[PDB]
DNA sequence: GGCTG
DNA sequence: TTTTTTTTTTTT
């Protein structure tokens, strides 16, 4: 897999989601966001349990509220198809 | 010295020809070394040649590696160089390194096995070998070497073949001359011998007859019965040796005076061994329990057997596989391997009795495609016989032996012969 | 559980007589536990008896330890009580503890051997063994089971074996002379006996006949029905005992007066036992249900059954395997093994029926291979008789019984004998 | 009162004897209580004795749950202590607690089933029971009262048994004299009777004739057709009752006046029940479906059947085995067992049809071994009748009914008799 | 990879002559690589030869590029080396690179076509191909392969095929004149050849004779034995090669001196091959284990065989059959297919033997109809030689060889021939 | 204020 | 990898 293009594409997709924070240390890339599937916690409006982890082989999104866990490609295919088109195309561009 | 090994795999040819078939990915640490070896192995599998530095840098770019893995592999590839040394120290050093890595992997595996065993049921991992499988793993790791024998090479291995021609292995003779004829003098020490038969047709009768015959020859015989009580097996032996029918013993036809007289007459004979019958519950004994029994017999009774007899192979515990984990074939094959290993370790002729399938029951002829529990038993066994007392041999008080697998001689010479089974005395007499 | 082991070493002679043979200072710990065990071992060596708390404390005062170890030993010695736990659990738990500590010590030893092997020859210690000693080291730590019994000897124990020949308490007569003749004194306790036939041939008829015969001998019979109702089977038992008919009961030919008179006359007999009929839904019972039923029967009434009749093993449900987890050869054999284990635990004669495949439903003879369910049932069975009925036999009201698996006696002495089955009375009649 | 229950399970032998057989793991909690009871249950299963505090602590140390669970179990065990109590207050309170917990678990499962069935398919988390078995689960929550029925005693309970012979409410007489004669009073409630004919020989004509005969004898009949429409079966019943050929109805040889007159003449007769025909798609109805049909018939139509008829069991779906998972043998045996369970539950005479093998077609005789889909169906069926038709029999307007499995009487007597089937009127007539 | 491609275009000849026709400017880049390739192509067009580095730099100096383009091209030109990579890997990797770039270009072109299609018709480019041209364009991307070899093309490979007929590229001679006569020059590679042995003929004598003949002709022979050990088969080989009788070795007539002298005399000859004997248990070697054996021999022993001789086809086990019947037709047909597939995929001559039909045993003439394996062996066998040993032939030390199936040549040309079998030396000699 | 597989 | 039912087919 290609991790840096997943980090670049994931950011824009999760940028729309509110409570968006870039948890980027010296060796990891994570994105904190409110989960778009369930709206995160109904009682707490300030909780952002949706996370993106891009330091692995494949950048994966995981929600700690509704237990959603998916790759960034499936997330883009299911929710942002205009962003999904360029995402799968840019793969061939660099490969 | 992983860097040296990789460098001389890439830049040297005699070293590659000598060490490559024995290298494995598990011998390298999970860092850059294992990934670099993966690239080299993939290139060799795809092109049947040793890759260059350019080939690997192309393979690295065309790889699904993380940034850390990519950087480590690139640094390791950059660090590789052809240091001139001797092709007699490199090979031995590589062999030492591979042996050390194999021992390390075996130690980690047995530690994981012991950790898995102590876990409670319904949470412990399945298909993972039990504690009793630990020594066997440690026996495999010590066997790693850069020398491999695949088949017998004519004109390259002919001294050993001449030795095999001139020399003959020692044999523990039977008392029945027909078995000596079909085995060229008897059975060897480290062997697993099986007497397959149908249900209620004489599996224990033949084993008890063999035990009596060996006891009359001065051997120390251990009869491990997994299905019958100790008194029942000893009564079979008494009927064999005291020439009194089991009906006579049960009905009380023989008196205590005659029984004691016959027992003392047998005792006074110098050509007599010691027979010890040990009973275990069904599925409650394994090879390690047998080793504990042997240790206590040696320590507390000064008893070292030669003719260890197991009543039934299919009942004993696996000792390598957890109970109710694998299928019958795998479990029975593991039991056979463990029993043969025990026989080799103790230098004892081991005799057992498996059960044939339902098809072989009341069938005038049987073959290797009749074993019920496992067809891998003949491969593990060293001599295998059958019992074919189906319909009319019982009326004639006789039997039949197929000789399914005979490693001592040739099975197609006296393949089928008739045995005079006498069930009252629980013995085999010869038709001659 | 070192505290429990030490407490029951000091305060229990039965525990000391089975565990002290197999106990070492390496098994316990490196701190206060090892020092306490060393004090116990020193005291038992100097004086051949188990020490007391006062004697142990005096020895601790005599022996020399540093301050920390002295405090630890005093604290541990203070914590010793009788605590009469179960003996079986205690010995099993101490065996497990010894095995796990021995495995830990063996793993540490082989790790030390491997670490010493990598050292240069000048630096390495000559006391530690080579790597080639790794496997057997791991094997001697897998043969430390607690078992001091070695087994029979056939020459040192022939008096005890002859005395065992006179113990006929296991036999249970049949009330039928032919069955006693072919079983050499009837069935034995803790055995799985099977009565197999085709569909609608008289399997439950034979089971009820055996129940009535055992009832008339004074035994306690527990009939477990799996298809019929309790009142239906009791009707068959009434037809056997009162000896009138099955149709006459349902056709009103029996006046209440006669029924009451016959029942009271049978009550007056002192040779009559107790019969309890229990029904279960198909596929909903096994030994686990049977053991709870046994406990409830014993609690509610003074009823400990000597005979346990199961209407059919197939209709029964295995304990571990689910309703349809595996095929017939497994779960049927599992149910057979569980029933035999229940019988040998309760020391009761277990009777059950078995079905025959369609190939022998209309044949003049039936073989052991004609078992509808798993062929493991004719491996756990002990006296598997067979019922064969033809048109000529039904004309004479004489079912043929063939001896299929005879573990008690000679299977071929009286292989086929005719019975006098009366279907109206649900009774087997011997033929003379 | 979980602490009291556990404490008296530990420190009371009398309490353990009665409460234990019934105690289950789902009656305490999801935390410390369930873990402590699991420890106790494992110890009991391993040693058949009540563990002590030391044994519980040892098992706790050899357990794999987390720190919170370990601390909770340790506190709960430390809190266990025997108290001066009386057997009655404890048994009654335990019964109340167990009943309350059973009701709570039942209603939680009912809510889970309701909230699971209200989900889109393919995402409904299969292996969860459907809403149809919502009340049955509640029926299991009420059948827990510490009062398990040990069984029926032959001598202690015989007045109640005798008040079941002249009752005769179990038997439902036929209308044909020969069928009553062979069954000695007709079929019995809670049974499974079967017709085996082949393909296009009868076997639904016979079922319709039985339905008509029962309907004439003041019975409520529930015909269930898995392979024919509701109007075809009703047309067959009309042809049987009105004595008008099926050809006459097809060819319009009967007027509306005659049809109306015959129907009203039948209606005005007091000796006539109600027949209801229900159609299900092939393979789309099971025992649970039939129970739902029974409930909705009782409620909506106040119709309580006694002669429930199913056209073909082989065409029905098992309510336990997933479709096409097990072979024909297991699936058909399970379906027949479930149908018999339904029949005994609702106390109705259940009639069904079964196919024979291809080899039995166009044969002058049909044996029991010719059953098509399973050999277990004859074993799990109270009565079976074989319908045989040859060219000579067809030319004589007769069929030979052979008694294959006759559980109500002796099958050898009157094994084969010739019925006068009239195929035009879908009626069976006798020849006597 | 582009750097390597350009470097080996500049500094190689075979690579250039192989990959230049399939090299385009659009395959490289839009930057320095494209400019460098344009310079190379311009130079090769103006001067039909590969440019040198100095000439390339002169062309770059006399070219129209900007500052950044000049720097990029200069750096890339300075970064090209004459390093020696292997040709096969280079061609395969540049083919993959070209294919990937062509696919990317085609995908971009079709995306651009679709984007232009969704534009105001008044406003679009005319040069852009229509949407209907999309499937063809991708086809041109998929039709890119440096070397097209899909099967044998008639009229396009006739010159290569003629070189096969003249050079007899497929034939492997027999060393026996008669066998070469009837095979038109011996057996062929990728074939399965079997011998049919009538009653009284051994199957391993002929196979050992063929193995010895191939060994004397320089071929690598892999002899896989089933019913015999490696030493026994190699002893048969020694009997044939050293002219020593088989019984003389066992008796001890031949001493170590003569044996070693003959072996070293054979080793001196340069016309001798290698024989590797591998033993497998009966039924424990399918034609997938042989693939693993070949892989191990190639990797470790560097032994790549040209002749593979299996001791007996019947003893082997069919792959993907999960069964091993002693004498079943389905297995023999599958075993033959698997062995012939192995021969085809390994380009080796495969030999095996089978037993003829019992009728074939009695009759001196053997018909394809008279074969134990009917329609299974005379369907997957290129050559099936039949061996007949009657009393008169045995008295004359001869065996009648009959040709039952000859894919090689006409079966009826020389069907019957007499062979000089020597059973002591296990040899076949010709008859004048 | 983070936490998955 | 064996085991057992049922069927269908085919080969001897
Ligand atoms: N007490 C006895 N008296 C006479 N003959 C006996 C007696 N017990 C067994 N036999 C005979 O001995 C034969 C062989 O019995 P076994 O030795 O138990 O064979 P088996 O294979 O061990 O039977 P298993 O273990 O139940 S499969 C039986 O078939 C009987 O004919
Ligand atoms: N409409 C009809 N008119 C006259 N005769 C009929 C009619 N339908 C059926 N029959 C006769 O009734 C015989 C048996 O009918 P069925 O009861 O349907 O047979 P069947 O065994 O139920 O069919 P299957 O294969 O089990 S669904 C046939 O062989 C016909 O001779
Ligand atoms: N009510 C009855 N009156 C007379 N004879 C009967 C009666 N019930 C059964 N029989 C006879 O009993 C014989 C077989 O009895 P069963 O016990 O039913 O055989 P079984 O089927 O092997 O036992 P099951 O299936 O567990 S009830 C039948 O062949 C009938 O002849
Ligand atoms: Mg036995
Ligand atoms: Mg029955
Ligand atoms: Mg029908």
Give a concise summary:
The structure is cut from a larger assembly and holds one copy of chain A (95 residues) and four copies of chain B (432 residues). Chain A is an alpha+beta fold and 95 residues long.
What does this molecule look like?
It is classed as replication/dna/rna. Keywords: phage, complex, helicase, REPLICATION-DNA-RNA complex. T4 Bacteriophage primosome with single strand DNA, state 1. Chain A: DNA primase. The organism of A is Escherichia phage T4. This is part of a larger assembly, with 1 copy of chain A (95 residues) and 4 copies of chain B (432 residues). Chain A is of the alpha+beta class and 95 residues long. Chain A has helices spanning 3-16, 72-79, 81-94, and strands at 21-24, 29-33, 50-53, 60-63, 69-71. In chain A, strand 3 (50-53) and strand 4 form a beta hairpin. The longest helix of chain A is centred in the N-terminal third of the chain and has 14 residues, at 3-16. Chain A starts with a helix and ends with a helix. Chain B is an alpha/beta fold and 432 residues long. Chain B has a domain at 177-430: Rossmann fold (3-Layer(aba) Sandwich), CATH 3.40.50. In chain B, 44% of the residues lie in helices and 8% in strands. Chain B contains 16 helices and 10 strands. The longest helix of chain B is centred in the first third of the chain and has 29 residues, at 89-117. Chain B is elongated, with a radius of gyration of 28 Å. The termini of chain B are far apart. The A-B interface holds A 1, 3, 55-57 and B 64, 66-67. Strand 5 of chain C pairs antiparallel with strand 1 of chain D. The structure holds phosphothiophosphoric acid-adenylate ester (3 copies) and magnesium ion (3 copies). One phosphothiophosphoric acid-adenylate ester (AGS) sits between chains B (197, 199-205, 227, 246, 423) and C (379, 406-407, 409-412). Chain B binds 2 DNA strands through residues 326-330, 357-358, 372-376.
